């Protein structure tokens, strides 16, 4: 689609950076950005990245199963819901998850305003 | 204020109505509303309700396993992500589903602007 392609473009970029070094994701978040990771609530790039960095695993790889997006308003922002697998420490057994991002335009890219993450037992 | 309690109340109302009589979910949607039901994309209360009513089951029950909510902006709107089990008809084994709602404050209540729904398979 368009919003699915627009959302996918950014999401792939986001996960590519997450999988190579999640400590460098700061630029994709802003001061008012919020992260709710398995109920843990963080606000701001600093605290959000700290949380992601703190996650207990060396290597991680995201495998996307489904991705659905819609314009979050008439003005340019996008809402995307993703379900996929998290492969950690080079382990074959996947850890399924569901995630939602509220993306705000910034130049030809976006930054994350809302990030909601949940493990989703398989 | 309490967007967590707001989400609990709205989602409970929504799924209760969906499980009771989905043909009456119309007033929770508006003309601009968008529903992505798996591969189906609909806009407007009429088409959205039509799609939900077309689902060929006689009985359905939503069982929430996770619920998260964050303010979608500084102006009152809310983002809600839900994951849970969907029991269709007399099927014993439930299906996993994930859903995100972007709720807009309609004066003194809310309506769904964004509705993204997906069944998740292992």
């Amino acid at each position: 689609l368009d919003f699915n392609t627009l959302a996918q473009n950014f999401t792939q970029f986001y996960y590519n950076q997450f999988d190579t070094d999640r400590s460098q994701l700061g630029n994709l978040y802003r001061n008012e950005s919020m992260l709710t990771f398995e109920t843990s609530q963080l606000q701001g790039a600093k605290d959000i990245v700290e949380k992601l960095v703190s996650l207990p695993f060396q290597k991680v790889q995201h495998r996307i199963t489904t991705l659905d997006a819609q314009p979050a308003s008439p003005y340019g922002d996008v809402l995307v819901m993703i379900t996929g697998d998290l492969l950690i420490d080079e382990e074959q057994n996947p850890q399924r998850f569901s995630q939602v991002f509220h993306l705000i335009p910034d130049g030809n890219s976006y930054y994350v305003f809302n990030d909601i993450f949940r493990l989703n037992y398989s | 204020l309490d967007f967590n309690t707001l989400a609990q109340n709205f989602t409970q109302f929504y799924y209760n109505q969906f499980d009771t009589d989905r043909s009456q979910l119309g007033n929770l949607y508006r003309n601009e509303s968008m529903l992505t039901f798996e591969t189906s994309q609909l806009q407007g209360a009429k088409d959205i309700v039509e799609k939900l009513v077309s689902l060929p089951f006689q009985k359905v029950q939503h069982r929430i396993t996770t619920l998260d909510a964050q303010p979608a902006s500084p102006y009152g709107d809310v983002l809600v992500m839900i994951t849970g089990d969907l029991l269709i008809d007399e099927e014993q084994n439930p299906q996993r589903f994930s859903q995100v709602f972007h709720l807009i404050p309609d004066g003194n209540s809310y309506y769904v602007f964004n509705d993204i729904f997906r069944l998740n398979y292992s």
Partner: peptide, 5 residues
């Protein structure tokens, strides 16, 4: 504990 200014 999510605020805006």
């Amino acid at each position: 504990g999510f605020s805006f200014g």
